[PDB]
Design an enzyme around this catalytic site. Sequence first.
Site, PDB file in Angstrom:
ATOM      1  N   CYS A 110       0.833  -1.199   0.000  1.00 16.54           N
ATOM      2  CA  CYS A 110       0.000   0.000   0.000  1.00 16.54           C
ATOM      3  C   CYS A 110       0.870   1.252   0.000  1.00 16.54           C
ATOM      4  O   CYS A 110       1.660   1.469   0.923  1.00 16.54           O
ATOM      5  CB  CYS A 110      -0.956   0.016   1.199  1.00 16.54           C
ATOM      6  N   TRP A 282      -9.242   6.506  -0.418  1.00 17.38           N
ATOM      7  CA  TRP A 282      -9.557   7.233  -1.634  1.00 17.38           C
ATOM      8  C   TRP A 282      -8.591   6.779  -2.725  1.00 17.38           C
ATOM      9  O   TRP A 282      -7.574   6.127  -2.459  1.00 17.38           O
ATOM     10  CB  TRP A 282      -9.491   8.752  -1.425  1.00 17.38           C
ATOM     11  N   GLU A 287      -5.033   3.965 -10.542  1.00 18.42           N
ATOM     12  CA  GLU A 287      -5.845   2.771 -10.320  1.00 18.42           C
ATOM     13  C   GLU A 287      -7.012   2.721 -11.299  1.00 18.42           C
ATOM     14  O   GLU A 287      -7.327   1.658 -11.850  1.00 18.42           O
ATOM     15  CB  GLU A 287      -6.356   2.725  -8.881  1.00 18.42           C
TER      16      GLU A 287
HETATM   17  C1  HEM Z   1      -6.160   6.610   2.237  1.00 23.42           C
HETATM   18  C2  HEM Z   1      -5.878   6.486   0.933  1.00 23.42           C
HETATM   19  C3  HEM Z   1      -5.250   5.209   0.305  1.00 23.42           C
HETATM   20  C4  HEM Z   1      -4.577   5.193  -0.853  1.00 23.42           C
HETATM   21  C5  HEM Z   1      -4.300   6.411  -1.762  1.00 23.42           C
HETATM   22  C6  HEM Z   1      -4.155   3.837  -1.111  1.00 23.42           C
HETATM   23  C7  HEM Z   1      -3.441   3.406  -2.213  1.00 23.42           C
HETATM   24  C8  HEM Z   1      -3.281   2.080  -2.557  1.00 23.42           C
HETATM   25  C9  HEM Z   1      -2.953   1.589  -3.870  1.00 23.42           C
HETATM   26  C10 HEM Z   1      -2.735   2.496  -5.099  1.00 23.42           C
HETATM   27  C11 HEM Z   1      -2.864   0.255  -3.793  1.00 23.42           C
HETATM   28  C12 HEM Z   1      -2.574  -0.708  -4.947  1.00 23.42           C
HETATM   29  C13 HEM Z   1      -3.976  -1.105  -5.422  1.00 23.42           C
HETATM   30  C14 HEM Z   1      -3.945  -1.996  -6.644  1.00 23.42           C
HETATM   31  O1  HEM Z   1      -3.024  -1.852  -7.477  1.00 23.42           O
HETATM   32  O2  HEM Z   1      -4.861  -2.844  -6.797  1.00 23.42           O
HETATM   33  C15 HEM Z   1      -3.152  -0.158  -2.428  1.00 23.42           C
HETATM   34  C16 HEM Z   1      -3.154  -1.445  -1.933  1.00 23.42           C
HETATM   35  C17 HEM Z   1      -3.508  -1.813  -0.642  1.00 23.42           C
HETATM   36  N1  HEM Z   1      -4.038  -0.972   0.323  1.00 23.42           N
HETATM   37 FE1  HEM Z   1      -3.980   1.054   0.271  1.00 23.42          FE
HETATM   38  N2  HEM Z   1      -4.582   3.032  -0.068  1.00 23.42           N
HETATM   39  C18 HEM Z   1      -5.272   3.849   0.820  1.00 23.42           C
HETATM   40  C19 HEM Z   1      -5.881   3.428   1.984  1.00 23.42           C
HETATM   41  C20 HEM Z   1      -5.835   2.164   2.509  1.00 23.42           C
HETATM   42  C21 HEM Z   1      -6.514   1.733   3.707  1.00 23.42           C
HETATM   43  C22 HEM Z   1      -7.434   2.633   4.576  1.00 23.42           C
HETATM   44  C23 HEM Z   1      -6.214   0.434   3.893  1.00 23.42           C
HETATM   45  C24 HEM Z   1      -6.661  -0.526   5.025  1.00 23.42           C
HETATM   46  C25 HEM Z   1      -7.062  -0.107   6.235  1.00 23.42           C
HETATM   47  C26 HEM Z   1      -5.338   0.011   2.814  1.00 23.42           C
HETATM   48  C27 HEM Z   1      -4.812  -1.255   2.647  1.00 23.42           C
HETATM   49  C28 HEM Z   1      -4.275  -1.728   1.465  1.00 23.42           C
HETATM   50  C29 HEM Z   1      -3.870  -3.094   1.187  1.00 23.42           C
HETATM   51  C30 HEM Z   1      -3.954  -4.279   2.171  1.00 23.42           C
HETATM   52  C31 HEM Z   1      -3.403  -3.136  -0.066  1.00 23.42           C
HETATM   53  C32 HEM Z   1      -2.871  -4.392  -0.796  1.00 23.42           C
HETATM   54  C33 HEM Z   1      -4.040  -5.033  -1.523  1.00 23.42           C
HETATM   55  C34 HEM Z   1      -3.597  -6.284  -2.271  1.00 23.42           C
HETATM   56  O3  HEM Z   1      -2.573  -6.905  -1.909  1.00 23.42           O
HETATM   57  O4  HEM Z   1      -4.291  -6.669  -3.238  1.00 23.42           O
HETATM   58  N3  HEM Z   1      -5.119   1.090   1.989  1.00 23.42           N
HETATM   59  N4  HEM Z   1      -3.400   0.991  -1.712  1.00 23.42           N
HETATM   60  C1  LIG Z   2      -8.437   1.140   0.692  1.00 18.10           C
HETATM   61  C2  LIG Z   2      -7.900   1.217  -0.717  1.00 18.10           C
HETATM   62  C3  LIG Z   2      -7.630   2.422  -1.336  1.00 18.10           C
HETATM   63  C4  LIG Z   2      -7.129   2.396  -2.645  1.00 18.10           C
HETATM   64  N1  LIG Z   2      -6.840   3.550  -3.278  1.00 18.10           N
HETATM   65  N2  LIG Z   2      -6.931   1.226  -3.307  1.00 18.10           N
HETATM   66  C5  LIG Z   2      -7.213   0.050  -2.705  1.00 18.10           C
HETATM   67  C6  LIG Z   2      -6.979  -1.079  -3.271  1.00 18.10           C
HETATM   68  C7  LIG Z   2      -6.817  -2.153  -3.739  1.00 18.10           C
HETATM   69  C8  LIG Z   2      -6.572  -3.447  -4.399  1.00 18.10           C
HETATM   70  C9  LIG Z   2      -7.204  -4.566  -3.596  1.00 18.10           C
HETATM   71  N3  LIG Z   2      -6.837  -5.895  -4.094  1.00 18.10           N
HETATM   72  C10 LIG Z   2      -7.611  -6.878  -3.297  1.00 18.10           C
HETATM   73  C11 LIG Z   2      -7.165  -6.000  -5.527  1.00 18.10           C
HETATM   74  C12 LIG Z   2      -7.677   0.038  -1.411  1.00 18.10           C
END
Ligand code: HEM
Ligand SMILES: Cc1cc(N)nc(C#CCCN(C)C)c1
Lengths: 414, 418
Positions: A110, A282, A287
């Site tokens: 993330c 957000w 994405e």
């Molecule tokens: C607040 C703004 C946030 C932004 C801008 C952000 C951004 C991102 C992005 C760009 C990805 C890659 C997504 C993809 O390529 O499918 C990601 C993955 C992830 N985010 Fe964040 N995120 C945010 C908040 C959060 C929050 C609130 C959580 C959990 C409480 C979180 C947990 C995760 C996890 C676990 C992944 C990995 C998902 C996977 O392995 O498929 N994120 N995030």
């Molecule tokens: C909280 C959140 C914010 C964001 N901007 N992006 C994501 C994502 C994702 C990918 C999840 N994965 C299981 C495919 C999640």
Amino acid sequence: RFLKVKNWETEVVLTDTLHLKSTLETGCTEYICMGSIMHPSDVATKDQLFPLAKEFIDQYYSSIKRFGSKAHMERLEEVNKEIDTTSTYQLKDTELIYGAKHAWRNASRCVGRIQWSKLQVFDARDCTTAHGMFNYICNHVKYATNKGNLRSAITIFPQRTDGKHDFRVWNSQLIRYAGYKQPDGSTLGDPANVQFTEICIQQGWKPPRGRFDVLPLLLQANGNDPELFQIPPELVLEVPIRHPKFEWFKDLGLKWYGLPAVSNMLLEIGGLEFSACPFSGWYMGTEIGVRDYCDNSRYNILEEVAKKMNLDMRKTSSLWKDQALVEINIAVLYSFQSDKVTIVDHHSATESFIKHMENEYRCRGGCPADWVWIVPPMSGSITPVFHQEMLNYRLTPSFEYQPDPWNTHVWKLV
Amino acid sequence: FLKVKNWETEVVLTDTLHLKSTLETGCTEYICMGSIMHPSQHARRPEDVATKDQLFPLAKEFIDQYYSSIKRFGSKAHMERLEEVNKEIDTTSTYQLKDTELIYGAKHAWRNASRCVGRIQWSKLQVFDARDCTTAHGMFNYICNHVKYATNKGNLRSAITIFPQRTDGKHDFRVWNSQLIRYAGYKQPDGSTLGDPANVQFTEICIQQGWKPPRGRFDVLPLLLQANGNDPELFQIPPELVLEVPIRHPKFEWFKDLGLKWYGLPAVSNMLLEIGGLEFSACPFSGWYMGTEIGVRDYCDNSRYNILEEVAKKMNLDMRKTSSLWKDQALVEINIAVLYSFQSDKVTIVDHHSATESFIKHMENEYRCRGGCPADWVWIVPPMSGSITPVFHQEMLNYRLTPSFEYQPDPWNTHVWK
Ligand code: HEM
Ligand SMILES: Cc1cc(N)nc(C#CCCN(C)C)c1
Ligand code: HEM
Ligand SMILES: C[C@H](O)[C@H](O)[C@H]1CNc2nc(N)[nH]c(=O)c2N1
Ligand SMILES: C[C@H](O)[C@H](O)[C@H]1CNc2nc(N)[nH]c(=O)c2N1
Ligand SMILES: Cc1cc(N)nc(C#CCCN(C)C)c1
Ligand SMILES: [Zn+2]
């Protein structure tokens, strides 16, 4: 022991000691690296649960500067009693909040983790039915959406018990668009969601068969058969996509939803497994603009946009795809900003992540990070993360993948 | 067995070749080091002249592999070869490769280079045996011939020139340049940098050695050649051997006024070729460019030529906020210009779409015939437009096979001058 990571653009060198705390496997071995594998690899017994619970309670009490305290030792004893008598235990509200935030802090894939300690945690552990789940999810969506000024939030449903009574959101995100395979082989709507759309239709959903049909919620409580619910349309904020310079862009009829809300992951805190834990933040523009719109397996709009741009599409070396991809991502950011819906561009997001990462090395001793996921899917090397060495390791609490529920659920009706 | 999946096509490949890996990657089951530039210092033999029980096992391994490759394992020639290497090590502490073994080893070092997206070409490699070389003057001759052959008036041909292997570590042959052709970089009075900032240190050594810098933005550096451990010597590559491309744009007539050019021949000269425990510390190799190496990294890295500002100004983009994506927009146009310029001058170049498509094909070929292909996703995925290339969606396994190309220390960090 210490491990050093270097940024090759700035020559800053950071020192990782936090990796000594890592727990489970990366998937790599000493002789093979599996860093680009997407998924590298019934319920815990009493003996397995004790040390996991202790490690988490120890780290909680160390975080609040009460390690060794009377309250620390009494909590350990209390947790031990519960495991002994019930084969599980229950988190205090403070520990659940701490655990959910640290699962985010520990999410190596993330890029938005600079925001980790500002997470609104909704405790839904008293929920017992799919109707109750629907109510909790509506409240989450309304709180998180906040008329476009989006706020990070998570809702945590009851933890796994015997594995036969799981709570699950069958959706992969709370808000997604349906996909419909056509007789002629084409797809209407989002091709990624075709399978889940078929399950909904089978359960009795009557689909509009448009290009951007918000899917219904498919909610499973206590291991029962999942049930369908329509999210009230006034809670689903959407942004129509237009371009600041190309007046024809709005004629593509594109739109997207404002709230990214992952609902198929599993949250692990101190050995306890929360199989339903939808969380939302957000968007980063790429994405939507790079993956959702331009993946060949998704909405796949590059050809149509390049046509309206009058690009030379006969040869790859004209870079018509690259040129169209940039304009699409310009349109996504302009549209969200014009409608005052929170969004972050990939340059701002990766810059903030470097600041977060350096702060984490200073105050915590490291920051697990998955370069393959952190680097954005366009313009990689003009963002600072491209040049940043990173170490990937698994800390707990953590968010985890889990099987899709239709591959394991044993149905009950008729 | 280990499987890799392509998430676009759903193709799944099964890897058995990784069972033959020799060196540590740096990763453990608890930590992944896949984005570390130099994750491991695990070498096959110690710092300098090995003993017999250190070198002979590595030689036996490579000779075994070579004779296996030609269906002659255990053959008369294989067993004589082993006895021959045993005597050479016995009497000289090293051994010499046959011409056929040298060619096999160089081609396989390229085939094993997990970071190279160009490897579908691996068996098309011209090998120049320069192991009779004794002086820096001879090295200059060998390098000039390599450059002229490889350039081929713009129809570029892959080549490697192999100078004498390391003996004791005090008689090393080294090309001090990092590539045979690079531009100088100069520290300016006000604090800025003219030319290529990556080469400021190497440029100062050359000036300190008597090179007279023209002090422009694209001054081709002299060669700094070290033979048999002696002090390095400066040579000017004849400019008619140095093919250059002026950069212009098919639509923007002002682009030519930016005064950009680049050279046609990418020729890596600071790596070490390891074959059967032997270390070839000077082994310059060259192919042809992928456009993004010039247009994304050389031109647009902040610590290189850093031209995004200039180009965006001329394009009249809104440079007030990152979210206008003015950097991304200028980046594309620069890379269109680079490809268009090379193609207009009939100089071999490949775009990142064609290169990554070829590498997926190469991967499939290698899994079908060899049981695997080591590949470093972090390096294979191009530095722009990642996910619209097929390699972005391809899972890869990275492991270290021998023969191989390795990094080595910069010679000014270790040379004691005479
Ligand atoms: C607040 C703004 C946030 C932004 C801008 C952000 C951004 C991102 C992005 C760009 C990805 C890659 C997504 C993809 O390529 O499918 C990601 C993955 C992830 N985010 Fe964040 N995120 C945010 C908040 C959060 C929050 C609130 C959580 C959990 C409480 C979180 C947990 C995760 C996890 C676990 C992944 C990995 C998902 C996977 O392995 O498929 N994120 N995030
Ligand atoms: C909280 C959140 C914010 C964001 N901007 N992006 C994501 C994502 C994702 C990918 C999840 N994965 C299981 C495919 C999640
Ligand atoms: C023929 C056309 C070729 C193309 C298009 C090509 C392409 C590339 C590219 C784009 C890189 C990444 C370079 C960087 O980002 O700095 C690379 C790396 C590499 N290439 Fe190739 N290459 C070619 C030929 C060769 C040849 C002939 C050899 C050796 C005989 C070779 C060996 C390597 C090695 C060892 C690396 C890794 C370098 C490192 O770790 O710094 N390549 N290649
Ligand atoms: C094969 C490769 O691991 C896979 O395509 C990854 C690459 N990096 C990614 N990075 C992000 N943020 N999201 C993704 O889905 C992927 N996919
Ligand atoms: C830290 C990171 O590994 C480093 O910046 C790498 C990333 N990927 C790369 N990929 C290529 N082809 N070339 C490079 O120089 C780099 N640099
Ligand atoms: C033969 C060749 C062709 C090409 N197109 N690119 C390269 C490269 C490189 C980087 C080497 N590394 C030491 C920095 C090499
Ligand atoms: Zn690894």
